[PDB]
Amino acid sequence: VQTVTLIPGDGIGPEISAAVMKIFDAAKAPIQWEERNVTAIQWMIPSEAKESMDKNKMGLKGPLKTPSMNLLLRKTFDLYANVRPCVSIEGYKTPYTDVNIVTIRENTEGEYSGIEHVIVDGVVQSIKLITEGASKRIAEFAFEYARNNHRSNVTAVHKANIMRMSDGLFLQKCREVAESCKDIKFNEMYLDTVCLNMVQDPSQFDVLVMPNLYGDILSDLCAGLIGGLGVTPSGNIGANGVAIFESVHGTAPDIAGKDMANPTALLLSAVMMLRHMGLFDHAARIEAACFATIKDGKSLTKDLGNAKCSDFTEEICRRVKDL
Amino acid sequence: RHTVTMIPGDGIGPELMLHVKSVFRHACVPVDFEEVHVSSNADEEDIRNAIMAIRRNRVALKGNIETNHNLPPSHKSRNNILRTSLDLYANVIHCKSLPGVVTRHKDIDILIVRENTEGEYSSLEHESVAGVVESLKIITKAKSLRIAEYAFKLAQESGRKKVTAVHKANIMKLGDGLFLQCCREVAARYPQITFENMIVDNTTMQLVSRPQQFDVMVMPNLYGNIVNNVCAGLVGGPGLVAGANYGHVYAVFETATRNTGKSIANKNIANPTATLLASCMMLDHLKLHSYATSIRKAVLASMDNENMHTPDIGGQGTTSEAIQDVIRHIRVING
Ligand SMILES: [Mg+2]
Ligand SMILES: [Mg+2]
């Protein structure tokens, strides 16, 4: 029975986070919630926020307000790998129904090196940084993730035709990990090809591994295929076994306390959290309970049913009991 | 009679160029193609002579040249060398829903204007220490103003109502910030055009759910690459959409998606639509508007017929059968 650092956040943050705690207990999960409010101070995140996470290893985060706290958390815990599993959701119907993709984003460098220069008046240089160490690590994670989640294929996404030295080096590290892991099927694809094919037949893709910007954009595109940020889980793996799983939609302040919010995403991130540590049994129950609720019909939230947050939550709890 | 440079390119390039000539003959187009080839040679003489040929003729139709990304950085994309040498600053594509090609979205009508010489395509890279590589994304005021002027002028001339600048200025504060600021200065001179902006990630989300909201879109180089291919995909794929590359004096025409298509080459299955629509685009640029309109009506009419569809749009027809039908449609137009 281990402890999970909980960061309710702002707006609908508390409501949905309450909804996740109620479902986790209804499922009898060996998880107790240790609430913590992060805020930039002195910048840095608070002493007690840093300390909970440093011993617990696992955190869960609702939507925060906007020095970015998400940027702080990344540098504070060296969150190098952004993972976004996008699976088409039965009941919630988009024009794309066969989607099952995991985008694995290098999250420390690339085009977010933070380095821009005014070379002369009217001429700006933005530095894209690709390193050997960081590329190998994201590649090692991508393949390690694929094995542990029973994934057949990994695709490295790149523009090495145009950015030869940088995207090339990233690809070279993806190749070295691949030949040392013949277990998983590895291919390489141009970013524009991936984009072109994704919106036609997204069912062709499995695990996508890529540098920072391409990952930033594709994770969002893939999420747009399955319904949006309201229904999409996200995890961030760091150094020393630390890992934070999160909501990525807005705080929705204009419905903050009206029992009008949707906790699907935060729940799915929570389900994703349970799988990372090894509690595979519970993870599957809550998930199936969630999917069946959405498929079911009327119990829906306003973004999704003319129903309140607490009914939808209540239906899930009820259904996870009858495993 | 006009002399136009033709660069066959790789993959499906050469086979589709033969059909372009064949269609031009049947329509009695007063255009003579002067062919220039570009090998895989590490040497640049081929790509330089092609530049020289376009400098002379001012107009070109080209297939895509394959870039081997396993070669050293000294070996640069020939398509890019060409684009940037001739300063063809505006890549322009028009993604419009075709009534005969049913996809997941309809009522798409988007004009994408993409900065075509700068940005992350600047080919500036170095290794300071072993395993540490820097790539230099260059954004300038001159080129950002230039492409924004083009997008707003195009919007006004073709009677469009909204221009959307696509960017990452929230993270790339100085670079993408400068691009956006240049778009805004031009916007002040086009008060009758609605100017909006959108972050590139959200843009891709909006495109896969509600692409009908977009009118004209303007952006720097890499984001154009992404949005072009997303929009091309939404309306049915690489075989359908023509691409133009405009400089102040030169112009080069191609397919919007710039794909080699080596895996379908020499199988009589390539979709000829994008390439033919690109040649019409070129004919319009040459002021041969009546020939452009004849051929374009022929290819669009053939696309209405499901039986003429090639495999890329879920049909079973050959390339030559599609061309047969396009030619059948033309020889009744001109008698
Ligand atoms: Mg993003
Ligand atoms: Mg290409």
Swiss-Prot record, chain A:
Subcellular location: Mitochondrion
Cofactor(s) this protein cannot do without: Mg(2+); Mn(2+)
Enzyme nomenclature, EC number: 1.1.1.41
Domain of life per record: Eukaryota
Outcome, altering residue 198 to T: In RP90; uncertain significance
Site entry: Critical for catalysis: 112, 159
Cofactor annotation comment: Divalent metal cations; Mn(2+) or Mg(2+). Activity higher in presence of Mn(2+) than of Mg(2+). Binds 1 Mg(2+) or Mn(2+) ion per subunit.
Reactions it catalyzes: D-threo-isocitrate + NAD(+) = 2-oxoglutarate + CO2 + NADH
Disulfide bonds: none
Residues recorded with modification N6-acetyllysine: 182, 302
Matching Pfam families: Iso_dh
GO annotation, cellular component aspect: isocitrate dehydrogenase complex (NAD+); mitochondrial matrix; mitochondrion; nucleus
InterPro entries: IsoCit/isopropylmalate_DH_CS, Isocitrate_DH_NAD, IsoPropMal-DH-like_dom
UniProt keyword list: Acetylation, Disease variant, Magnesium, Manganese, Metal-binding, Mitochondrion, NAD, Oxidoreductase, Phosphoprotein, Retinitis pigmentosa, Transit peptide, Tricarboxylic acid cycle
Binding site for Mg(2+): 192, 216, 220
Residues annotated as binding substrate: 74, 84, 105
UniProt function note: Catalytic subunit of the enzyme which catalyzes the decarboxylation of isocitrate (ICT) into alpha-ketoglutarate. The heterodimer composed of the alpha (IDH3A) and beta (IDH3B) subunits and the heterodimer composed of the alpha (IDH3A) and gamma (IDH3G) subunits, have considerable basal activity but the full activity of the heterotetramer (containing two subunits of IDH3A, one of IDH3B and one of IDH3G) requires the assembly and cooperative function of both heterodimers.
Family (UniProt): Belongs to the isocitrate and isopropylmalate dehydrogenases family.
Entries under PANTHER family matching the protein: DECARBOXYLATING DEHYDROGENASES-ISOCITRATE, ISOPROPYLMALATE, TARTRATE (PTHR11835), ISOCITRATE DEHYDROGENASE [NAD] SUBUNIT ALPHA, MITOCHONDRIAL (PTHR11835:SF34)
Disease: Retinitis pigmentosa 90: A form of retinitis pigmentosa, a retinal dystrophy belonging to the group of pigmentary retinopathies. Retinitis pigmentosa is characterized by retinal pigment deposits visible on fundus examination and primary loss of rod photoreceptor cells followed by secondary loss of cone photoreceptors. Patients typically have night vision blindness and loss of midperipheral visual field. RP90 is an autosomal recessive form.
Name this polypeptide is given: Isocitrate dehydrogenase [NAD] subunit alpha, mitochondrial
Biological classification of the source: Eukaryota, Metazoa, Chordata, Craniata, Vertebrata
Recorded name of the encoding gene: IDH3A
Swiss-Prot record, chain B:
Effect after changing residue 223 to F: Significantly impairs the activation of the heterodimer composed of IDH3A and IDH3G subunits by citrate and ADP
GO molecular function: ATP binding; isocitrate dehydrogenase (NAD+) activity; magnesium ion binding; NAD binding
Cofactor: Mg(2+); Mn(2+)
Effect in UniProt of substituting residue 120 to A: No effect on the activation of the heterodimer composed of IDH3A and IDH3G subunits by citrate and ADP
Binding positions (Mn(2+)): 201
Binding, citrate: 67, 80
Residues that, per the record, bind substrate: 83, 114, 201
Annotated phenotype, changing residue 83 to A: Significantly impairs the activation of the heterodimer composed of IDH3A and IDH3G subunits by citrate
Effect of residue 137 to A: Complete loss of the activation of the heterotetramer and the heterodimer composed of IDH3A and IDH3G subunits by citrate and ADP
GO biological process: carbohydrate metabolic process; isocitrate metabolic process; tricarboxylic acid cycle
Gene Ontology cellular-component terms listed: isocitrate dehydrogenase complex (NAD+); mitochondrial matrix; mitochondrion; nucleolus
Subcellular localization(s) per the UniProt record: Mitochondrion
InterPro entries: IsoCit/isopropylmalate_DH_CS (IPR019818), Isocitrate_DH_NAD (IPR004434), IsoPropMal-DH-like_dom (IPR024084)
Regulation: The heterotetramer and the heterodimer composed of IDH3A and IDH3G subunits can be allosterically activated by citrate (CIT) or/and ADP, and the two activators can act independently or synergistically. The heterodimer composed of IDH3A and IDH3B subunits cannot be allosterically regulated and the allosteric regulation of the heterotetramer is through the IDH3G subunit and not the IDH3B subunit.
UniProt keyword annotations, A-Z: ATP-binding, Magnesium, Manganese, Metal-binding, Mitochondrion, Nucleotide-binding, Transit peptide, Tricarboxylic acid cycle
UniProt-listed Gene3D superfamilies: Isopropylmalate Dehydrogenase
PROSITE patterns xrefs: IDH_IMDH
Recorded superkingdom: Eukaryota
Textual note on the cofactor: Divalent metal cations; Mn(2+) or Mg(2+). Activity higher in presence of Mn(2+) than of Mg(2+). Binds 1 Mg(2+) or Mn(2+) ion per subunit.
Role noted for this protein: Regulatory subunit which plays a role in the allosteric regulation of the enzyme catalyzing the decarboxylation of isocitrate (ICT) into alpha-ketoglutarate. The heterodimer composed of the alpha (IDH3A) and beta (IDH3B) subunits and the heterodimer composed of the alpha (IDH3A) and gamma (IDH3G) subunits, have considerable basal activity but the full activity of the heterotetramer (containing two subunits of IDH3A, one of IDH3B and one of IDH3G) requires the assembly and cooperative function of both heterodimers.
PANTHER family documented for this protein: DECARBOXYLATING DEHYDROGENASES-ISOCITRATE, ISOPROPYLMALATE, TARTRATE, ISOCITRATE DEHYDROGENASE [NAD] SUBUNIT GAMMA, MITOCHONDRIAL
UniProt record similarity statement: Belongs to the isocitrate and isopropylmalate dehydrogenases family.
Name the UniProt record assigns to this protein: Isocitrate dehydrogenase [NAD] subunit gamma, mitochondrial
Lineage, top ranks: Eukaryota, Metazoa, Chordata, Craniata, Vertebrata
